């Protein structure tokens, strides 16, 4: 007979046919999936009086346990079984309620922001409900649905109730970001953005995807803070951090200005770095898990040797700051010293007037001042062999994988910013953001500047041709530029940064899959021209959107500070050696646009930045960022079982893919990053990769590390993020 406990709580006969129907429903259009198999594996686990919810968990998991490269459509079987389950949880039945009825109920429960009701009339909610296609829910992979349920869908964190489904999420985010649009154009904007995101053309960060529509206004998920050489600025920096990490924002910290140990910070740098670390960890589960930061300083800082080894675990406690990552800042002069086999002279920034500013803004001024201070021996200084200092840095980079590199000359010669007025002097946590900052007096200092960036990404696997990017760039830029006005700013310097420059960072996901589907690879050069073709279209249309918006709504307050204002374009400033590795001509009229920019300006001072992605890409089943997958099947753990995701279209493309470890080396990949950077406003989170078993006695040689470092330099690469080392 087999009894079952219902959705509320009392028994009833077991209906094996109902279960079989839901399975048959979920299996429609899928290939190589056995309903019968799933039935066998789940029925065996049942028992007299099983709670009805647990019957679903069991079939979902049973479908999920069968995901393989051979049978990838189990991704969608399990997903649909989960969507179905999530529906009955949220609504009581499969069919979602009417949009208005749902919104009203949610605002009344304190889960959706009440302004939605203000800003839209019931008729306007009836119209939006007709844009919605709930069957788009059937298009998610299993791992996507786990993410939605984990960190997207409005839910009761304590009771574990889910209150909403993915399309309501999507429609309402659209409603909020365009809420303040004129009736004339508002709803058509809402529709076209809903479509773009529900069909995965556009990806959006977790804070925006989980909160926009709810009573909250905290969406900033990465901040950049520069710290002056004073105890007031140290405290301002520290207090800013605490406020930001309490909202789970990543932190990039420039601290190279802090004077060296034994100066007229008699005690120097490291006690203050410790302080920032505990600042960063001040809202972390147990002073360890969550809250992240990258701290930046120059390669020529007097304390550099101690700073390089800060996360090496073979020191005493006062010599180590293990739980932050670091960005070493390098320029052309520094490399030359390595190449020419010469010395590098270390100065405390406090002792060398004008030297720190030039290091970013003016290369031949830096040249002059540096050599002056090298000859002038009243100045406190240390001398190191260039090879040895680079050796140490790369040594620490290789073992921890998280000592980064920032080419500061490249960030300022090839940049949307005039390095005299607004130099780029640091990055963020992941090394893709590059914006002006100004140190702070005081937490509330209105003359400071904290760079924030708002993010999104185009899904290169979901667009059919490059010209779809025009509509999509209109949508992404507008949606994000509205968000800048929507969100709150807990620190005035941050508000200054965001309203002055209105900076955005829109990048790509699914690039690997894109290359595969165009039969190109990473390691051989075969994807150079296609990348040039591809990243030209991106940047051109992004600038076109921001331009159309400056014409509609006025250029950003500080626009005059961009090289753009001066009539310069990325296509004018890119590292010239890029010419030697791609001959793709430009396809879009950069000149008509150069002019239209000189005339009407840009709504946003930056538009593009290539960030890593993990969660965004999982949602639309995409390869992460610009990264080659490590293998065909991604394995993840969650208390709900092993989570498996199969690379998109494995079936037709398995040999088209060039999996990460199949790359003979880094040169090909580093060349693509270079070609990409030609058009990218900000920077790119670019990794370096090494398999020991490609090298004599499984040891990666220093020679190779330095060669790849210089290669990245040569192709105008702004930043170098992770070094991944394979094992076994």
């Amino acid at each position: 007979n087999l009894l079952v406990t219902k959705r509320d709580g009392s028994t009833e006969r077991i209906n094996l046919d109902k279960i079989h129907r839901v399975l048959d429903w979920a299996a429609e259009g899928l290939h190589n999936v056995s309903i019968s198999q799933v039935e066998l594996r789940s029925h065996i686990q049942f028992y007299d009086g099983i709670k009805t919810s647990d019957i679903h968990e069991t079939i979902i998991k049973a479908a999920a346990d069968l995901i393989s490269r051979d049978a990838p459509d189990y991704q969608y079987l399990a997903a649909r079984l989960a969507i179905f389950h999530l529906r009955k949880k949220a609504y009581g039945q499969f069919e979602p309620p009417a949009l208005y009825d749902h919104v009203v109920k949610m605002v009344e429960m304190g889960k959706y922001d009440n302004h939605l009701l203000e800003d839209y009339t019931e008729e306007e909610f009836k119209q939006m409900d007709t844009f919605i296609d709930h069957d788009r829910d059937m298009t998610f992979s299993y791992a996507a649905v786990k993410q939605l349920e984990g960190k997207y869908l409005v839910q009761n964190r304590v009771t574990g109730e889910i209150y909403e489904s993915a399309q309501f999420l999507y429609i309402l985010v659209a409603a909020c970001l365009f809420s303040n649009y004129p009736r004339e154009t508002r709803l058509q904007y809402v529709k076209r953005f809903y479509d773009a995101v529900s069909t995965f053309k556009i990806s959006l960060p977790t804070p925006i995807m989980s909160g926009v529509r709810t009573p909250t206004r905290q969406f900033s998920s990465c901040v950049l803070i520069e710290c002056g050489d004073s105890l007031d600025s140290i405290n301002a920096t520290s207090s800013a951090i605490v406020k930001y990490v309490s909202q789970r924002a990543g932190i990039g910290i420039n601290a190279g200005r802090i004077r060296a140990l034994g100066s007229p910070f008699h005690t120097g740098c490291i006690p203050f770095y410790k302080h920032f670390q505990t600042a960063v960890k001040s809202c972390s589960q147990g002073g360890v898990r969550g809250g992240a930061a990258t701290l930046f300083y120059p390669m020529w800082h007097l304390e550099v040797e101690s700073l390089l080894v800060l996360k090496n675990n073979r020191g005493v406690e006062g010599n180590r700051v293990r739980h932050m990552d670091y960005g070493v800042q390098i320029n052309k002069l520094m490399y030359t010293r390595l190449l020419k086999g010469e010395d590098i002279t270390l100065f405390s920034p406090s002792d060398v007037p004008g030297l720190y500013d030039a290091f970013f803004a003016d290369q031949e001024e830096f040249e002059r001042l540096y050599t002056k201070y090298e000859k002038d021996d009243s100045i406190r200084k240390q001398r190191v062999k260039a090879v040895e200092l680079f050796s140490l840095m790369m040594q620490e980079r290789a073992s921890t994988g998280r000592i980064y590199i920032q080419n500061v000359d490249h960030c300022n010669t090839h940049s949307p910013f005039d390095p005299a007025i607004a130099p780029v002097r640091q990055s963020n946590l992941c090394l893709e953001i590059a914006l002006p900052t100004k140190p702070l007096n005081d937490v509330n200092d209105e003359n400071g500047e904290i760079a924030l960036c708002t993010l999104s990404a185009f899904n290169l696997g979901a667009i059919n041709n490059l010209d779809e990017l025009e509509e999509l760039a209109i949508l992404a830029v507008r949606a994000l530029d509205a968000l800048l006005d929507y969100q709150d700013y807990p620190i005035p310097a941050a508000k200054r940064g965001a309203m002055g420059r209105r900076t955005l960072g829109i990048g790509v996901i699914n690039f690997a899959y894109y290359l595969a589907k165009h039969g190109k690879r990473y390691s051989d050069g075969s994807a150079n021209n296609l990348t040039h073709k591809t990243f030209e279209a991106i940047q051109y249309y992004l600038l076109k959107a921001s331009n159309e918006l400056a014409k509609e709504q006025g250029a950003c307050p500080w626009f005059n500070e961009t090289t753009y204002a001066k009539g310069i374009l990325p296509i004018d400033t890119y590292k010239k050696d890029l010419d030697t590795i791609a001959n793709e001509p430009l396809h879009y009229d950069w000149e008509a646009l150069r002019e239209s920019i000189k005339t009407h300006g840009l709504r946003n001072s930056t538009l593009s930045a290539l960030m890593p992605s993990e969660t965004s890409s999982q949602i639309s089943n995409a390869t992460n960022g610009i990264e080659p997958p490590r293998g065909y099947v991604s394995i993840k753990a969650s208390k709900d079982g092993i989570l498996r995701q199969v690379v998109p279209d494995y079936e037709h493309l398995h040999d088209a893919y060039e999996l990460l470890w199949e790359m003979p080396g880094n040169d090909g990949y580093l060349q693509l990053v270079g070609i990409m950077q030609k058009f990218i406003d900000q920077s790119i989170s670019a990794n370096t990769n090494y398999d020991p078993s490609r090298f004599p006695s499984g040891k990666v040689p220093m020679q190779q590390l330095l060669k790849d470092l210089l290669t990245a330099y040569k192709f105008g690469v702004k930043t170098l993020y992770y070094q991944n080392t394979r094992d076994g």
Partner: peptide, 16 residues
């Protein structure tokens, strides 16, 4: 582990 083996002559060729 890495192999600390730098050749300053091998590097010096490279044009930045």
């Amino acid at each position: 582990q890495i192999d600390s083996e730098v050749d300053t002559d091998d590097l010096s060729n490279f044009q930045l």
